[PDB]
Amino acid sequence: HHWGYGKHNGPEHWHKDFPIAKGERQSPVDIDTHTAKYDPSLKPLSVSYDQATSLRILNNGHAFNVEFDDSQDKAVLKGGPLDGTYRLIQFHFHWGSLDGQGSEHTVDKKKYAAELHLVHWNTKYGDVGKAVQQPDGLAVLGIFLKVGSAKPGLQKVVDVLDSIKTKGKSADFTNFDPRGLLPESLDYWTYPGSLTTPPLLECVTWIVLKEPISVSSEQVLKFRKLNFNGEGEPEELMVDNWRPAQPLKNRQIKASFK
Ligand SMILES: NS(=O)(=O)c1ccc(C(=O)NCc2c(F)cc(F)cc2F)cc1
Numbered sequence: 001h002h003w004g005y006g007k008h009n010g011p012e013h014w015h016k017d018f019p020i021a022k023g024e025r026q027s028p029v030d031i032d033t034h035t036a037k038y039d040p041s042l043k044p045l046s047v048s049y050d051q052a053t054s055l056r057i058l059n060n061g062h063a064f065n066v067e068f069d070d071s072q073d074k075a076v077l078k079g080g081p082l083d084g085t086y087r088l089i090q091f092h093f094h095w096g097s098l099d100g101q102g103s104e105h106t107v108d109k110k111k112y113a114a115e116l117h118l119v120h121w122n123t124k125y126g127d128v129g130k131a132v133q134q135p136d137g138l139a140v141l142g143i144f145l146k147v148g149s150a151k152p153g154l155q156k157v158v159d160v161l162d163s164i165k166t167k168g169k170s171a172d173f174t175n176f177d178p179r180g181l182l183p184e185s186l187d188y189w190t191y192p193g194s195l196t197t198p199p200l201l202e203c204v205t206w207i208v209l210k211e212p213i214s215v216s217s218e219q220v221l222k223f224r225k226l227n228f229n230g231e232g233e234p235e236e237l238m239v240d241n242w243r244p245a246q247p248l249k250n251r252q253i254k255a256s257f258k
């Protein structure tokens, strides 16, 4: 009745309702480090999350989203392969039921334990709704999570999950600083792609960071305790909410580093 990640309505079935699933610029993709083109004309990333204002957190089935106030240029992304100012609207993760799987993008076929998506939209379009009808409407900052040491900045997110356990639940979530989720370096790979969940619109410039951030087993264990189902429905654990890699077709992955 509605897409999911299970046997009967998983990624393999999405093309039936969303023909674009078999498009030419789909995501995620595998990043073959040896074929990425070092492009020295790529500018450095400019992350400006100092005036960032988180509002809430919700479980929408599929995953959990932390939402931000995007009525003003408070938190922005610019530079890199981007032209123009992009506003932060929300961030979420994709993870697996085991540590050796969970990320959407892979590196030389290697899958990480999870992947953080920081979703931005092109301000020249006025609102997110218009941005999705354009080839350069969205920009998603992708960050890989590896299991190791605890990540301080992630803990406030972890302590609130118990209140949004099932589909539809939301909790007030103010004063969260996203800068606590960034690795030391901002070296990246970039390529034109799409949303990794229906509608799968091909309106995204992907910026995947090279350096992953570390998170502890307990931190990740808590993501795994969330629920796909709403309250009162039978219980299905929210794990493995990732789409497998898609064909690169006629695309080239550039690297901002040598
Ligand atoms: N895993 S991922 O980073 O690729 C991803 C990021 C954002 C969204 C999303 O905002 N919902 C769809 C959506 C849309 F398709 C059009 C619109 F105007 C608003 C939306 F919210 C979906 C997937």
Ligand SMILES: [Hg+2]
Pocket: 131, 132, 133, 134, 135, 136, 137, 201, 202, 203
């Ligand atoms: Hg578009």
Ligand SMILES: [Zn+2]
Pocket: 092, 117, 196
């Ligand atoms: Zn996403």
